[PDB]
Write an enzyme that holds these catalytic residues in place. Structure first.
Site, PDB file in Angstrom:
ATOM      1  N   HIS B  26       0.828  -1.206   0.000  1.00 14.75           N
ATOM      2  CA  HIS B  26       0.000   0.000   0.000  1.00 14.75           C
ATOM      3  C   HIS B  26       0.868   1.263   0.000  1.00 14.75           C
ATOM      4  CE1 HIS B  26      -1.957  -3.356   2.101  1.00 14.75           C
ATOM      5  NE2 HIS B  26      -3.119  -2.857   1.720  1.00 14.75           N
ATOM      6  N   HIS B 261      -4.394   3.349  -2.661  1.00 11.45           N
ATOM      7  CA  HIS B 261      -4.433   2.748  -1.325  1.00 11.45           C
ATOM      8  C   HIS B 261      -3.666   1.424  -1.208  1.00 11.45           C
ATOM      9  CE1 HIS B 261      -6.215  -0.162   1.589  1.00 11.45           C
ATOM     10  NE2 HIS B 261      -5.977   0.826   2.434  1.00 11.45           N
ATOM     11  N   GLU B 410     -15.978  -4.160  26.224  1.00 10.75           N
ATOM     12  CA  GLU B 410     -15.160  -5.383  26.255  1.00 10.75           C
ATOM     13  C   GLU B 410     -14.009  -5.361  25.253  1.00 10.75           C
ATOM     14  OE1 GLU B 410     -18.484  -5.418  25.795  1.00 10.75           O
ATOM     15  OE2 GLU B 410     -19.203  -6.148  27.734  1.00 10.75           O
ATOM     16  N   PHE B 436     -19.581 -13.003  26.723  1.00  9.38           N
ATOM     17  CA  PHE B 436     -19.154 -11.794  26.008  1.00  9.38           C
ATOM     18  C   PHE B 436     -17.655 -11.791  25.665  1.00  9.38           C
ATOM     19  CE2 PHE B 436     -22.844 -10.076  28.550  1.00  9.38           C
ATOM     20  CZ  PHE B 436     -23.747 -10.349  27.531  1.00  9.38           C
ATOM     21  N   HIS B 472     -27.066 -15.083  27.502  1.00  6.64           N
ATOM     22  CA  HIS B 472     -26.084 -14.951  28.566  1.00  6.64           C
ATOM     23  C   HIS B 472     -25.462 -16.274  28.974  1.00  6.64           C
ATOM     24  CE1 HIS B 472     -27.528 -10.867  28.914  1.00  6.64           C
ATOM     25  NE2 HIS B 472     -26.770 -10.633  29.967  1.00  6.64           N
ATOM     26  N   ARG B 519     -20.419 -19.294  38.098  1.00  8.85           N
ATOM     27  CA  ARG B 519     -21.244 -18.504  38.987  1.00  8.85           C
ATOM     28  C   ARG B 519     -21.590 -19.307  40.257  1.00  8.85           C
ATOM     29  NH1 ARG B 519     -27.620 -17.588  39.216  1.00  8.85           N
ATOM     30  NH2 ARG B 519     -27.707 -15.372  39.838  1.00  8.85           N
TER      31      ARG B 519
HETATM   32  C1  LIG Z   1     -22.188  -6.779  25.700  1.00  7.10           C
HETATM   33  C2  LIG Z   1     -22.630  -6.774  27.137  1.00  7.10           C
HETATM   34  N1  LIG Z   1     -21.718  -6.505  28.091  1.00  7.10           N
HETATM   35  C3  LIG Z   1     -22.034  -6.503  29.399  1.00  7.10           C
HETATM   36  C4  LIG Z   1     -23.340  -6.764  29.799  1.00  7.10           C
HETATM   37  C5  LIG Z   1     -23.733  -6.797  31.264  1.00  7.10           C
HETATM   38  N2  LIG Z   1     -24.562  -5.667  31.566  1.00  7.10           N
HETATM   39  C6  LIG Z   1     -25.927  -5.663  31.420  1.00  7.10           C
HETATM   40  S1  LIG Z   1     -26.563  -4.109  31.866  1.00  7.10           S
HETATM   41  C7  LIG Z   1     -24.979  -3.469  32.258  1.00  7.10           C
HETATM   42  C8  LIG Z   1     -24.722  -2.069  32.772  1.00  7.10           C
HETATM   43  C9  LIG Z   1     -26.000  -1.306  32.990  1.00  7.10           C
HETATM   44  O1  LIG Z   1     -26.271  -0.634  31.777  1.00  7.10           O
HETATM   45  P1  LIG Z   1     -27.385   0.494  31.871  1.00  7.10           P
HETATM   46  O2  LIG Z   1     -28.393   0.209  30.775  1.00  7.10           O
HETATM   47  O3  LIG Z   1     -26.642   1.786  31.882  1.00  7.10           O
HETATM   48  O4  LIG Z   1     -28.037   0.140  33.320  1.00  7.10           O
HETATM   49  P2  LIG Z   1     -29.485   0.694  33.788  1.00  7.10           P
HETATM   50  O5  LIG Z   1     -29.175   2.035  34.394  1.00  7.10           O
HETATM   51  O6  LIG Z   1     -30.257   0.718  32.491  1.00  7.10           O
HETATM   52  O7  LIG Z   1     -30.071  -0.317  34.750  1.00  7.10           O
HETATM   53  C10 LIG Z   1     -23.983  -4.526  32.018  1.00  7.10           C
HETATM   54  C11 LIG Z   1     -22.507  -4.321  32.259  1.00  7.10           C
HETATM   55  C12 LIG Z   1     -24.326  -7.051  28.746  1.00  7.10           C
HETATM   56  N3  LIG Z   1     -25.611  -7.312  29.088  1.00  7.10           N
HETATM   57  N4  LIG Z   1     -23.919  -7.031  27.457  1.00  7.10           N
HETATM   58  C1  LIG Z   2     -11.050  -4.901  11.060  1.00  7.75           C
HETATM   59  C2  LIG Z   2     -10.607  -4.702   9.634  1.00  7.75           C
HETATM   60  N1  LIG Z   2     -11.514  -4.669   8.639  1.00  7.75           N
HETATM   61  C3  LIG Z   2     -11.195  -4.496   7.346  1.00  7.75           C
HETATM   62  C4  LIG Z   2      -9.869  -4.335   6.986  1.00  7.75           C
HETATM   63  C5  LIG Z   2      -9.497  -4.164   5.514  1.00  7.75           C
HETATM   64  N2  LIG Z   2      -9.235  -2.749   5.301  1.00  7.75           N
HETATM   65  C6  LIG Z   2      -8.000  -2.251   5.507  1.00  7.75           C
HETATM   66  S1  LIG Z   2      -7.898  -0.545   5.205  1.00  7.75           S
HETATM   67  C7  LIG Z   2      -9.568  -0.453   4.793  1.00  7.75           C
HETATM   68  C8  LIG Z   2     -10.031   0.941   4.426  1.00  7.75           C
HETATM   69  C9  LIG Z   2      -9.442   1.865   5.492  1.00  7.75           C
HETATM   70  O1  LIG Z   2      -8.873   3.034   4.906  1.00  7.75           O
HETATM   71  P1  LIG Z   2      -7.746   3.931   5.647  1.00  7.75           P
HETATM   72  O2  LIG Z   2      -7.181   3.171   6.831  1.00  7.75           O
HETATM   73  O3  LIG Z   2      -8.361   5.286   5.872  1.00  7.75           O
HETATM   74  O4  LIG Z   2      -6.640   3.940   4.450  1.00  7.75           O
HETATM   75  P2  LIG Z   2      -5.581   5.101   4.052  1.00  7.75           P
HETATM   76  O5  LIG Z   2      -6.392   6.095   3.254  1.00  7.75           O
HETATM   77  O6  LIG Z   2      -5.030   5.599   5.372  1.00  7.75           O
HETATM   78  O7  LIG Z   2      -4.559   4.384   3.200  1.00  7.75           O
HETATM   79  C10 LIG Z   2     -10.160  -1.830   4.906  1.00  7.75           C
HETATM   80  C11 LIG Z   2     -11.587  -2.185   4.638  1.00  7.75           C
HETATM   81  C12 LIG Z   2      -8.876  -4.361   8.096  1.00  7.75           C
HETATM   82  N3  LIG Z   2      -7.551  -4.228   7.903  1.00  7.75           N
HETATM   83  N4  LIG Z   2      -9.297  -4.536   9.359  1.00  7.75           N
END
Ligand SMILES: Cc1ncc(C[n+]2csc(CCOP(=O)(O)OP(=O)(O)O)c2C)c(N)n1
Ligand SMILES: Cc1ncc(C[n+]2csc(CCOP(=O)(O)OP(=O)(O)O)c2C)c(N)n1
Ligand SMILES: [Mg+2]
Lengths: 665, 664
Positions: B26, B261, B410, B436, B472, B519
């Site tokens: 590239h 690119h 995560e 997760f 979950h 758990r």
């Molecule tokens: C991808 C993912 N990561 C972590 C969790 C665990 N989880 C569920 S709710 C939450 C935090 C609470 O979020 P929010 O909606 O801000 O809580 P609320 O005030 O709505 O009760 C987490 C860490 C999940 N359900 N999915």
């Molecule tokens: C997670 C992920 N998805 C897709 C790709 C393939 N890919 C690499 S660069 C690109 C376009 C991104 O353009 P940019 O980084 O802005 O390129 P530049 O103009 O800096 O050369 C894609 C789809 C990758 N390397 N990683």
């Protein structure tokens, strides 16, 4: 307040609380904080028919904050959907219609399965995309046959996840003004105060994407929320985020405003103090006043039935005016592929060579011509993945009728949007990226599998053959990682013809996502795959090259780009008096579904000398080769070099296959 | 023209020539980004080419990994151990110049990149480590840990969700030593960025709480230098410098197009480009001695001087703080304190503990005895039991705190953990629900590729989770990690196995370790109680021997299913079936043992084998063979009390016995 609105809102709260108490499990804080906004949306803005929860033109709703499930179940029950009081009394229990997080297909009125944070929003973006695409394709004159909104409720956790950021960038780029997200903004996360992990301006970020943002300062003020939703609906060019400032666990003297109210039952005494705070006087649990049911009956059932009746009348008139169009729409809503669509598909001749990404591309273009419901694209790799429909236009803010979708570098949002598109109904959808980056959308594939959605992934550049881009770009474990997941079909075609059959099986799917695993490099057309290809690939594994004797000396098993290698090895083995059978296994999952008699005919139990060949992890192959067999795989990462060189060094040569087979005899 | 411009055009022509020769790679981004990168490298970054692992060097991550010739050019020109012949072997088998940057493969490369988004998120982790270490070790005027973290990224990086998560986190932690140069050229791989991307990146970054500085002309190095100076002056916010460049700048026909690119320019276009640079060198791969001298003065000499001054101060610091300095030296070397393991818990027979809780007890024991420990959870500290109860929180107001609050992020947590491990000086871990693990999978993959000994605390490992339901409840997550090269997966069967598993995770030097934890409470196993470390170290061992020297059947199990297997053994004995029970906390560690050891655990003469695990059956046939069987779960789970699901899904003594008898 003594209004029926306040009573309904407090009934939602107390039902949610009581169901959680009885289950001794669940999340009461958000239903308590969010009940007023949700009530407002549900009874004053959404167009929906509790008696026909699958009405094609209903407003869609996604509870992205799935832990707040009792909020949704309360609303469904109270509104007259088929979720009964006994159902609510079985929240989180074996086989109930009210599982701990919302599950599409298990509960009347639930539009999407949520729980894994972030994905609800991204799924809703997909539903909104589908709505505009279908409207552009089918609406005529005064027939606004497809014309509805897409609503979601999310919390702070949703907005921290990267997949929601991707989806929100994409939605703004596409100007999806029918997408309206209510954000329950309560300053609390599972572990404590939100300010221990999060302090960005959500509002400014969303304006930066190009969303309309409206703030509601008092989440208990339903007049303010209604004004916001009205304002959101009047803005046609931007998706809207309504940030509704609430108190988590509103009403609980000891738990409100604290993470303690997020994720476990309030408790017996706290529940009584909370009801007291609501001026809720009923002594029995699960109490609902008849006048609350009547409130929902007038505002939701009667309104939704009228709306659906008017839509049905219009659809009748539409069908008279545009019979062929209406007939295509009915077929699409029913997921029916046009009779004979497959007669359009390509055929690869003996003595021809083609990469399976290119045969996939040819098939995509054949489908685009014969299957009007096809809609899909790539995560910024259209040229490389060969996903582009050359005779179709691009799906953009200026032309929603275009079929080619530019997802950008957003694999996870693509995967979730694809689920939303499939959930909407009316469309057959696919999405492409490099197989190595399938890992980026893995949680969305898992939701497709759980929701039983027949989406198709186009995963190209499937092995170390990729070459120069190196180990970060070369799949090793990706096949095993998908093959292990329940309800996902994984097909790795061995040549052009197998790939046509694989696409056919992907398109015909009704209840599971299909991952097509495809090569960058050219593959030769196989004699053994040429005739009856569809029926062979449908069996998952079949004898691609028979042994001379009835009982083989050895069985060679291979998939994808390794089948040609195995066939060459069979020839070289026969010279040395070893009579090998060759089995092409484009799909382990389809093979496992076959009868014992069929499996025995491909892999006879009496033949225990079995050698598998695949440029991917060895994990999983011993199901077929057993303790006495062996596998030539790759259990390290790849390298940066011309692909043929890596393949050579990693042992994928006839000479090496032959040697290892003999050591095993 | 200036020596600066000559050096810059040298970077450009070396990149182009190397890509031409490889016929792969590239060129556009090296061409557009050369000036900004040159400025950063020679005018601001403190680094010693002669000592590329200097602990206090400014770190650099090329997040836009495809621009790799840009980096290799700079490394070579600066005097790092990357030779001209190396450049001439770009993208070739065994070369030190692979298509994307590979940490550990090439002198001076700080991180492996290529998977977009992750470079930025990795850099955030390096910045966290730098501030944590500074807070722990600096005293008075002894600023022993005091450096910057720089990265270069493109549009693709900023579309990926992981970079969004990481940037939100970096602003929250006020990581003002993180400075990202954004090569903003309006082009992605498929064409005009405006086919998929129209947001205001500057406004988004300001919303997170970043300082944002725009450079209108990417070729103006004086403006780029002013932006970096301004970036360094702002100590409370991470900085994004959006540098507006032309991709493939200099190329008459490919500049400003996606065509530049990801393919070589081509022979004719390379000539037109070199004509554009007023580059008159008749030979490919040409570098004037005055360019090498420019880098020698601005990089080698500067870096030598800075490292020597740092060495002097370190010596002085050590006289004032010998304990701290000795601790730092050991930590920079990845050494664990002598006797640190004496501190670990032991579970007595008759006791019950969930392995998340035994994990939490161990975490707190390690916090007391291993000063380099640093980690947290993605908003699940309470549930994962990852919190160090006697330690403070890592925040903008106290970087000495050891408890990290990653928030619901995560993937960024996974990538940050890689950056923390790359920096050096710290043993790190991160927790979330096992289900997760899917959200940070691409970062686990980079940890495995980079050989980083990070530790994942993955709790709530099965359908036993119960009411939260199938979204979950892990099913396929074990297989998905077991299949991945260079990842250790350990699923301890009880509290003592979990202690051993943590010890193996902490002692790791070259692979990430996933701890898979329950758990629900598990009983302490008699067969795991003695010599637990050595047993778990073997990956699989006989936890409950058969009565006969040759068993009638072997029961294999892991984690929570080992107790079930031992129960089933007892029941089988009553019916005259003599079973051996094997606990397999780690398939990968068992696979590494001698054939002799393996044969002692799974003798080839016993073909009646039955595996039990609440997860996908995928992979078990390696051990049970064509004649054995497995009781696993190949559907999704359900929402119900966990014990009910376990019964319904067949994980009871009665069902195990039934099925075993069936294959006899
Ligand atoms: C991808 C993912 N990561 C972590 C969790 C665990 N989880 C569920 S709710 C939450 C935090 C609470 O979020 P929010 O909606 O801000 O809580 P609320 O005030 O709505 O009760 C987490 C860490 C999940 N359900 N999915
Ligand atoms: C997670 C992920 N998805 C897709 C790709 C393939 N890919 C690499 S660069 C690109 C376009 C991104 O353009 P940019 O980084 O802005 O390129 P530049 O103009 O800096 O050369 C894609 C789809 C990758 N390397 N990683
Ligand atoms: Mg919240």
């Amino acid at each position: 307040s003594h209004s029926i609105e306040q009573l309904s809102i407090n009934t939602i709260r107390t039902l949610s609380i009581d169901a959680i108490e009885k289950a001794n499990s669940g999340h009461p804080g958000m239903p308590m904080g969010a009940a007023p906004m949700a009530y407002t949306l549900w009874t004053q803005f959404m167009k929906h028919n509790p008696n026909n929860p699958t009405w094609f033109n209903r407003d869609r709703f996604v509870l992205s904050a799935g832990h707040g499930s009792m909020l949704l179940y309360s609303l469904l029950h109270l509104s007259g959907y088929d979720v009964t009081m006994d159902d609510l009394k079985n929240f989180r229990q074996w086989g109930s219609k009210t599982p701990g997080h919302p599950e599409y297909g298990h509960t009347a009125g639930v539009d999407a399965t949520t729980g894994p944070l972030g994905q609800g929003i991204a799924t809703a973006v997909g539903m909104a995309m589908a709505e505009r695409h279908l409207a552009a394709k089918y609406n005529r004159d005064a027939y606004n046959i497809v014309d509805h909104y897409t609503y979601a409720i999310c919390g702070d956790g949703d907005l921290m996840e990267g997949v929601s950021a991707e989806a929100s960038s994409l939605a703004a780029h596409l100007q999806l003004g029918r997408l309206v997200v209510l954000y329950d903004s309560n300053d609390i996360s599972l572990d404590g105060d939100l300010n221990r992990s999060f302090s960005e301006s959500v509002e400014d970020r969303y304006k930066a994407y190009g969303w309309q943002v409206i703030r509601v300062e008092d989440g208990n003020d339903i007049e303010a929320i209604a004004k916001a939703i009205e304002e959101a609906k009047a803005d046609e060019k931007r998706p809207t985020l309504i940030e509704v400032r609430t108190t988590i666990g509103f009403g609980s003297p000891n738990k409100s405003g604290k993470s303690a109210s997020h994720g476990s039952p309030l408790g017996v005494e706290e529940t009584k103090l909370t009801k007291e705070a609501y001026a809720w006087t009923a002594e029995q649990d699960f109490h609902v006043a008849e006048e609350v049911y009547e409130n929902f009956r007038k505002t939701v059932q009667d309104v939704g039935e009228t709306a659906q009746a008017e839509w049905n009348t219009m659809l009748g008139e539409y069908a008279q005016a545009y019979p062929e169009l209406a007939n295509e729409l009915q077929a699409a809503m029913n997921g029916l592929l046009p009779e004979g669509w497959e007669q359009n598909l390509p055929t690869y001749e003996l003595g021809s060579k083609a990469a399976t990404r290119n045969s996939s591309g040819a098939v995509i273009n054949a489908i685009a011509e014969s299957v009007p419901s096809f809609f899909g694209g790539s995560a910024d790799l259209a040229g490389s993945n060969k996903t582009y429909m050359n005779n179709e236009k691009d799906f953009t803010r200026d032309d929603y009728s275009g079929k080619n979708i530019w997802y950008g570098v957003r694999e996870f949002a693509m995967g979730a949007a694809m689920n939303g598109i499939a959930l909407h109904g009316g469309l057959k959808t696919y999405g492409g990226t490099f197989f190595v980056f399938s890992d980026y959308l893995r949680p969305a594939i898992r939701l497709a599998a759980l929701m039983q959605l027949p989406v198709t992934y186009v995963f190209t550049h499937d092995s170390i053959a990729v070459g120069e881009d190196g180990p970060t770009h070369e799949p090793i474990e990706q096949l095993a990682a998908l093959r292990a997941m329940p309800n996902v079909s994984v097909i790795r075609p061995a040549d052009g013809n197998e790939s046509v059959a694989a696409w056919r099986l992907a398109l015909e799917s009704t209840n599971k996502p299909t991952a097509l695993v495809l090569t960058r490099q050219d593959l030769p057309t196989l004699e053994g795959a040429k005739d009856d290809t569809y029926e062979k690939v449908a069996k998952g594994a079949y004898v691609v090259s028979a042994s001379k004797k009835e009982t083989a000396d050895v069985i060679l098993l291979a998939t994808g780009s390794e089948v040609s290698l195995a066939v060459e090895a069979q020839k070289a083995l026969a010279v040395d008096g070893v009579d090998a059978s060759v089995v092409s296994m484009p799909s382990m999952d389809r093979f496992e579904a076959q009868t014992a008699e069929y499996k025995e005919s491909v892999l006879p139990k009496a033949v225990t000398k079995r050698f598998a060949i695949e440029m991917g992890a060895t994990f999983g192959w011993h199901r077929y080769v057993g303790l006495e067999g062996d596998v030539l795989g790759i259990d390290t990462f790849g390298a940066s070099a011309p692909g043929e060189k890596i393949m050579e060094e990693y042992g994928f040569t006839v000479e090496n296959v032959v040697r290892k087979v003999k050591e095993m005899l």
